[PDB]
Design a binder for this molecule. Structure first.
Ligand SMILES: C[C@@H]1C[C@H]2O[C@@H]2/C=C\C=C\C(=O)Cc2c(Cl)c(O)cc(O)c2C(=O)O1
Ligand SMILES: C[C@@H]1C[C@H]2O[C@@H]2/C=C\C=C\C(=O)Cc2c(Cl)c(O)cc(O)c2C(=O)O1
Lengths: 214, 214
């Protein structure tokens, strides 16, 4: 099952650099950006559902779900939103321009808080504060399940998904956390970051916790 | 990705019948049978590891993990034991004879408690007390990941797994619970059944719980 490799738009590889290179504070901010994107994706599928209700049937429950995977140093955030086809993954997550990119970098470099990233429409790339690699696993009603992957170098891959659990519909962000950032695998840390920045999220935010029976 | 279909040995389709037809009590007993098989499978990989340590490397953590999936009316029990190749799934779970089968049925039908099922070496089939369908997803170090599936009819299928999460090594039992048996999706119910019957399990028994942040 062969990967296809794509080059990032120039200003995205630029934006990526850094965000990872010039940040410093309010990085736990990566999580509000994630949840915000997930909420918007769920907004999209519910809106679409008003005129096309059967779009919901692939996954009738509307949720955002966070699953720490401490063994793998991974944090997953799943939504049952609209999902992205192969072409949408390629276009949304790296090959097309985003209007707000260069303006966010030129901004940042004059003291903008990075919380501002979302106002420019490039909030996805804030995950590189805590992660040195990401896979975005997505399933749209209009396509098969695919995996987009990036380690913040100049290329990304997209591969037909024959390896991950089936998502009925929606997207999983799979963050591979930096060795110094393992705190975001912690139940208390996660709830603390969520209550602060995602109060008026309209969807259930589920946390998956593993407990030894003893 | 095509399924292969196999016929069950006669006395297994017989044993299946019923267990599901003549049971009545101590059915929560299905869980001790599961955990017992999982413990034995973990016993096997650790024993094998003494002379072949690198067998462990595909999944270094030794655990039993129970994951309720209430949306799907599913209960999963995962172990990181030795796992089963395609041929082992076909042989272990339905095509070869098991020495203790007929003796367990002839026994049962004179008032044996069904807790006895394990002493005859056929404890796997106790899952049909609570489940009307099962998939066994398995990954041995010696083969690809495969899915065995049965709904207690006379045939089962085995399919190369291109749909479920990767298990490094081991087996997941995926139980599709009967509509009247949804209690076994409940955190309290599960811990209660585990403490009673699996005290001297030597491995961590992990319970995966989903909690809304609120
Ligand atoms: C295109 C769809 C629907 C859009 O409404 C969402 C708003 C912003 C999305 C930005 C993205 O780049 C894709 C995306 C990300 Cl990054 C995410 O973390 C979660 C998601 O569910 C989606 C998605 O599926 O986005
Ligand atoms: C053959 C291997 C190793 C054997 O030591 C285990 C003892 C009994 C197994 C009975 C089976 O039929 C397979 C099996 C079941 Cl049913 C299970 O619920 C969990 C498991 O991990 C295995 C397994 O992988 O079994």
């Amino acid at each position: 099952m062969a990967s296809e490799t794509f080059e990032f738009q120039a200003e995205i590889t630029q934006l990526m650099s850094l965000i990872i290179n010039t940040v410093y504070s309010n990085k736990e901010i990566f999580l509000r950006e994630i949840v915000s994107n997930a909420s918007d994706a769920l907004d999209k599928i519910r809106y679409k559902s008003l005129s096309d209700p059967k779009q919901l049937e692939t996954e009738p429950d509307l949720f955002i779900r966070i699953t720490p995977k401490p063994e793998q140093k991974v944090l997953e955030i799943r939504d049952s939103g609209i999902g992205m086809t192969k072409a949408e993954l390629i276009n949304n997550l790296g090959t097309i321009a985003k209007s707000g990119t260069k303006a966010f970098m030129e901004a940042l470099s004059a003291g903008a808080d990075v919380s501002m990233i979302g106002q420019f429409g490039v909030g996805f790339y804030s995950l590189f504060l805590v992660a040195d690699r990401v896979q975005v696993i997505s399933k749209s009603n209009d396509d098969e399940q695919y995996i987009w992957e990036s380690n913040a170098g100049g290329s990304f891959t997209v591969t037909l998904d024959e390896v991950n659990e089936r998502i009925g519909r929606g997207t999983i962000l799979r963050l591979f956390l930096k060795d110094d950032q393992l705190e975001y695998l912690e139940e208390k840390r996660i709830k603390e970051v969520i209550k602060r920045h995602s109060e008026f999220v309209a969807y259930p935010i589920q946390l998956v916790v593993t407990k030894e029976v003893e």
